[PDB]
Design a protein around this nucleic acid. Structure first.
Lengths: 192, 143, 72, 120, 19, 144, 139, 189, 14
RNA sequence: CCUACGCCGGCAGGCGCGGGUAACCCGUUGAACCCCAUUCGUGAUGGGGAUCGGGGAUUGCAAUUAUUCCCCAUGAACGA
């Protein structure tokens, strides 16, 4: 466990956090060619307090948000969200029927799948379980864009390899890559 | 302390709700045109002990405070605690309080707009006036 | 939310401050301030009054920490 | 119009010594320092240009560089071009500016009205 | 005596400084 | 065993020397007693209605602690920490006119003497008085 | 009839002049309670409360303090009083009681009688002080 | 004889755990008048095991940024805290301190073993000196974060948290994080 | 309401 | 030009009067935090002082785009 009520509140109320999360969500939406210029249904993965999910609502999207933290969800409740919030661990799978969502988005969250604290399956197993179920719950030709924070290049390669084995194709977009203070990795994928 | 029975939970001095339970030397600061040093040098000539609060007072103390407060030269608040020293019109050493404070700020801005000076167009545009280094600032409040 | 503690005394406030205080095992202006919604200025002046009441022992006395103690 | 409790006819009939208590800190400071010969000559050209005008007419505008001139109340009613590097801005000296400089009336640069970032 | 003591102290201080 | 001012708690001595100057009553008191701070490097007014008296007492005692210190040294003793806004704090000195005229007012009571040495020191009357009040507070110390 | 020793921390010097006296302890004309960092009074009282004042019976102890800061001066006075009593009993009384009081002081704390081995050192060029250096940037 | 702060007794003090019995030095010749020692104890390895306990509670209390040389505020906070515990209990508060440090340090601890990317932890045994230091850090941290915005003086906060952890409450942040690491210890193994 | 004297410069400041 | 001392300035500063071409004279280089008492009492509050309106005094040919310093009044953001 990582967040509490105090820390979830301080994160969601910080103006600097709001601005950066909003910029990365809007960049993820620009990279999401499937919702870009289209209406869509969306899954927001690691939705937190709904800072990314509010910006999906701004473009007229209907969305479901998944997060593992109660306190992040409880803080989301008071923010007048239009999305459905669900308490859920993404590493156990995506619990929707095949072909439910046009797209999926995740901002600042999937690097937690490399962490082995919460559960006693390998991160490698949970990573496979995430990508294989994520491929299934997406429509055919659906898209997934994930902004994420990798600790090293091995973590990037492992994430890419698991997405590749699950049936995704696409690549990695690295914005501002000459500043390792401000650079951001976006995983940009599509299903078959 | 004691339980003062004439305790106005709301004070109304010069068009301002004052939280009368606050300390007297820090509840007069709450209105515009009076800060901390100024209300203290008022009270040292307004002859009220600092130990009391702002709701523990008599109206005779209130009327002598407002009497000294509108007559600052006649009660030895001499001519550097004043909000305005030399006005444009009369040059009269005089304190200016909240409604007149915004009135005279508006007066000076309207004047410098009418003057067509370097300051007045800044004040109409709502920018920095004292020549600041805005190569990294100008962030919050600009659109 | 608001810790706007009571600035002056009340009826029941003094009915606890004259009464409940010498039965605490520890009389601290923060503690008396904290249990009954009282500012530390108000409780600090009240505990100096409890010196003037003579009920309550004074053990320690410093800048910002002045320790009082219930008697016997 | 009134300035510091003194009127326009009262100011313009007042001597040069008694002005030096009616001004700001910098202005009484500089009038203590005493004016330069260039500004004396500029005020002399202003005297010549304000006198020879027709009585219906406003005086002929005199252009000048000296942005650090105290606007004396004797200059009120003239039209002065003030040089801000490129362009003489022509200001009618109204009596509201008797405690300022000329240099604030010809605003020197052009206001920044942003575009959009390219390659940042 | 006091003066002498003071002098001694001063000397000591000087020595310390040197060190 | 002539008691020493230095052998007493100094701030209880300051409070008693303030009370001693209050009981005296004769001194040329100035008129900016109810107006000013101590110097530029503080923010608010002092709470003491008798702050002139206790500062005069402490100034007489600092004259007792060393002779050869002028008003500029009296300015320099009463210094402090000016907060320069968001720019960091610095040491800033006392106020010249106030400390000068405190020394002048106590000079009126023949308690401050100008020397050949340029500064001002304590009078022999002054050291007699301070040792008397020192014995008073010494009896207030070793017999309380 | 007198012993003259000192105590030395970082900058604080404490000159001690002791002789046959009355139990007199002056620190430039003030007692050992009149030093405003007063909690450290107990450290300042460690030569008396460990040894007993009956062993400070007939000794005049003059203390004149130079330099340093307040805590450094307090440990210098503690230092100088302990070395002053030990040096007095060595020069004028036996070796045995001096050795005994040395063993009482050191086995409590060695810093009472020995000096401190370190000071605010000088600077080799390249930073604020000796160890930490200046900071830079990338990209 | 030698008593803390002029009055407080040390010969009544008793250690429960043999596993921590030497790594707290309070009993016989490590009792001093003040926590302010001002000697080196980080000279080499394990020399901060023979420094006094209340000196450790002192020197781990100037931890935060703005307080980072002001040890005299810390020793008066220690003095007021011992007096508050001596009021609310009556016993010798050093016994409360020893019982609080003993009941607060972890017993198993998780350590990331693998590669940088294999977060597959393994709950291992806690070293006794690190149990001591982890306990002192938890007690100081509970004194910190429960005294950020309150009316309570930080001496009162330290004293009450030391009381609550000496009896093993559900109220002590130190006992909360001890139970958290002991529950994470159940998970990794 | 641009003055008859001054340039376009100060008028862009208007 | 470093200053001491005195006088006049509610505060920045003036005026008179020496030493010092220098471990000397500033210099015992008399500091800040720290400490001991007072007031405040957990809230945008007396925290934070930004952002400004009136003045005042120095530096200088020249302070207007605030040179700097001072005195009122203004009190935003900021909840680690």
């Amino acid at each position: 466990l990582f967040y509490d009520e105090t820390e979830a509140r301080k994160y969601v109320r910080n103006s600097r956090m709001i601005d950066i999360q909003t910029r990365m969500a809007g960049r993820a939406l620009e990279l999401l060619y499937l919702p870009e210029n289209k209406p869509c249904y969306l899954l927001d993965i690691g939705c937190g307090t709904g800072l990314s999910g509010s910006y999906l609502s701004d473009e007229g999207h209907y969305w479901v948000g998944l997060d593992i933290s109660p306190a992040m969800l409880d803080e989301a409740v008071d923010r007048e969200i239009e999305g459905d919030l669900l308490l859920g661990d993404m590493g156990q799978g995506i619990p929707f029927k095949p072909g439910t969502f046009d797209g999926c988005i995740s901002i600042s969250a999937v690097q937690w799948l490399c962490n082995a604290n919460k559960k006693s399956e390998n991160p490698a197993k949970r990573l496979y379980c995430f990508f294989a179920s994520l491929f299934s719950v997406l429509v055919r030709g659906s898209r997934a864009v994930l902004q994420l924070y990798p600790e090293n290049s091995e973590q990037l390669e492992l994430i890419t390899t698991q997405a590749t084995k699950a049936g995704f194709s696409g690549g990695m977009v690295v914005d501002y890559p000459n500043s390792a203070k401000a650079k951001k990795f976006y995983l940009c994928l599509f299903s078959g | 302390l004691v339980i003062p029975e004439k305790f106005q939970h709301i004070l109304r001095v010069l068009n301002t709700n004052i939280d009368g339970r606050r300390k007297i030397a820090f509840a007069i600061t709450a209105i515009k045109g009076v800060g901390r040093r100024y209300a203290h040098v008022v009270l040292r000539k307004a002859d009220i002990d600092l130990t009391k609060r702002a709701g523990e007072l008599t109206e005779d103390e209130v009327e002598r405070v407002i009497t000294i407060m509108q007559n600052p030269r006649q009660y030895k608040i001499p001519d550097w605690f004043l909000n305005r020293q030399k006005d444009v019109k009369d040059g009269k050493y005089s304190q200016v309080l909240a409604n007149g404070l915004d009135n005279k700020l508006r007066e000076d801005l309207e004047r410098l707009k009418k003057i067509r000076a370097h300051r007045g167009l800044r004040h109409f545009w709502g920018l920095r006036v004292r020549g600041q280094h805005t190569k990294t600032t100008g962030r919050r409040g600009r659109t | 939310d608001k810790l706007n503690n009571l600035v002056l005394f009340d009826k029941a406030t003094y009915d606890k401050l004259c009464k409940e205080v010498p039965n605490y095992k520890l009389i601290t202006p923060a503690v008396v301030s904290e249990r009954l919604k009282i500012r530390g200025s108000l409780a600090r002046a009240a505990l100096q009054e409890l010196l003037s009441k003579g009920l309550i022992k004074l053990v320690s006395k410093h800048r910002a920490q002045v320790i009082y103690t219930r008697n016997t | 119009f009134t300035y510091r409790g003194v009127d326009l006819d009262q100011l313009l009939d007042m001597s040069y010594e008694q002005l030096m208590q009616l001004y700001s800190a910098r202005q009484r400071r500089r009038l203590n320092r005493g004016l330069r010969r260039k500004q004396h000559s500029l005020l002399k050209r202003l005297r010549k240009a304000k006198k020879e005008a027709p009585p219906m007419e406003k005086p002929e505008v005199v252009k000048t560089h000296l942005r650090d001139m105290i606007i004396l109340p004797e200059m009120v009613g003239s039209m002065v071009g003030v040089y801000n590097g490129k362009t003489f801005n022509q200001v009618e000296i109204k009596p509201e500016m008797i405690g300022h400089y000329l240099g604030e009336f010809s605003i020197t640069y052009k206001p920044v009205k942003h575009g959009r970032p390219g390659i940042g | 005596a006091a003066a002498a003591a003071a002098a001694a102290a001063a000397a000591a201080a000087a020595a310390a400084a040197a060190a | 065993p002539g008691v020493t001012v230095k052998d007493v708690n100094q701030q209880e001595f300051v409070r008693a020397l303030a009370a001693f100057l209050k009981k005296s009553g004769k001194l040329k008191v100035p008129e900016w007693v109810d107006t000013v701070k101590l110097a530029k490097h503080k923010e608010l007014a002092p709470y003491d209605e008798n702050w002139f008296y206790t500062r005069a007492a402490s100034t007489a005692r600092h004259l007792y602690l060393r002779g050869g210190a002028g008003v500029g040294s009296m300015t320099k003793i009463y210094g402090g920490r000016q907060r320069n806004g968001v720019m960091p704090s610095h040491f800033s000195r006392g106020s010249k006119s106030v400390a000068r005229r405190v020394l002048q007012a106590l000079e009126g009571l023949k308690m401050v003497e100008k020397d050949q040495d340029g500064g001002r020191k304590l009078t022999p009357q002054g050291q007699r008085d301070l040792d008397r009040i020192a014995g008073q507070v010494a009896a207030a110390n070793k017999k309380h | 009839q007198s012993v003259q020793v000192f105590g030395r921390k970082k900058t604080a010097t404490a000159v001690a002049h002791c002789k046959r006296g009355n139990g007199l302890i002056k620190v430039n004309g003030r007692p050992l309670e009149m030093i405003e960092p007063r909690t450290l009074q107990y450290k300042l009282l460690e030569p008396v409360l460990l040894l007993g004042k009956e062993r400070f019976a007939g000794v005049d102890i003059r203390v004149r303090v130079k330099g340093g800061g307040h805590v450094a001066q307090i440990y210098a006075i503690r230092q100088s009083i302990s070395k002053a009593l030990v040096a007095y009993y060595q020069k004028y009384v036996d070796e045995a009681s001096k050795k005994e009081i040395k063993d009482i002081l050191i086995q409590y704390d060695r810093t009472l009688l020995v000096a401190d081995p370190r000071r605010c050192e000088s600077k080799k060029f390249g930073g604020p002080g000796a160890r930490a250096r200046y900071q830079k940037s990338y990209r | 004889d030698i008593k803390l702060f002029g009055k407080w007794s040390t010969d009544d003090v008793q250690i429960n755990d043999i596993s921590l019995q030497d790594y707290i030095a309070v009993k016989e010749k490590y009792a001093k008048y003040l926590p302010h020692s001002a000697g080196r104890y980080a000279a080499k390895r394990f020399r901060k095991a023979q420094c006094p306990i209340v000196e450790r509670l002192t020197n781990s209390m100037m931890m935060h940024g703005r307080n980072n040389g002001k040890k005299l505020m810390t020793v008066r906070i220690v003095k007021h805290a011992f007096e508050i515990i001596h009021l609310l209990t009556g016993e010798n508060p050093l016994q409360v301190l020893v019982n609080a440090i003993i009941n607060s340090g972890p017993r198993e601890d998780s350590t990331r073993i693998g590669r940088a990317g294999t977060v597959r932890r393994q709950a291992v045994d806690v070293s006794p000196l690190r149990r001591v230091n982890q306990a002192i850090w938890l007690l100081c941290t509970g004194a910190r974060e429960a005294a950020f915005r309150n009316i309570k003086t930080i001496a009162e906060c330290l004293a009450d948290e030391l009381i609550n952890a000496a009896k093993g409450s559900s109220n002590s942040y130190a006992i909360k994080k001890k139970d958290e690491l002991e529950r994470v210890a159940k998970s990794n193994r | 309401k641009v003055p008859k004297g001054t340039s376009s410069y100060q008028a862009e400041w208007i």
